[PDB]
Design a protein around this ligand. Structure first.
Ligand SMILES: O=C1CC[C@H](N2C(=O)c3ccccc3C2=O)C(=O)N1
Ligand SMILES: [Zn+2]
Length: 111
């Protein structure tokens, strides 16, 4: 508990949409940060969150190339501007669901 925290809320870097909160960071496999690459070779510093808002989840889930064993993913866009912010994971265990958001696509700031 601190007065006037500046590192409280994550917003979409491109538009400001409210997306998540530092309090909702989730240490999957012991770390909230997972460094991964996709089939196109892009490297992502993914932060895992229990909860997020302000996104639009696109399509139906897929297990293909999943970075997290037992989870299927859907692309998560900023619901306001369409920026690709990460993925929603579902279908797994403990937790059943979570979000993996691309750290450098978010801005962190006060509540
Ligand atoms: O857990 C995941 C999320 C989806 C992510 N992914 C991508 O970022 C991607 C880009 C191009 C073609 C196919 C994929 C893909 O499966 C990926 O590689 N693993
Ligand atoms: Zn946005």
């Amino acid at each position: 508990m601190v007065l006037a925290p500046g590192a409280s809320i994550f917003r979409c870097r491109q538009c400001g949409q409210t997306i998540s909160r530092r309090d909702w960071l989730l240490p999957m496999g012991g770390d909230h940060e997972h460094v991964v690459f996709n089939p196109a070779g892009m490297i992502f510093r993914v932060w895992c969150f229990s909860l997020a808002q302000g996104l639009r989840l696109i399509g139906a889930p897929s297990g293909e190339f999943s970075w997290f064993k037992g989870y299927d993913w859907t692309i998560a866009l900023c619901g306001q501007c369409g920026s690709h912010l990460g993925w929603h994971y579902e279908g797994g265990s403990q937790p059943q669901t979570f979000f993996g958001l691309i750290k450098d696509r978010l801005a962190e700031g006060p509540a």
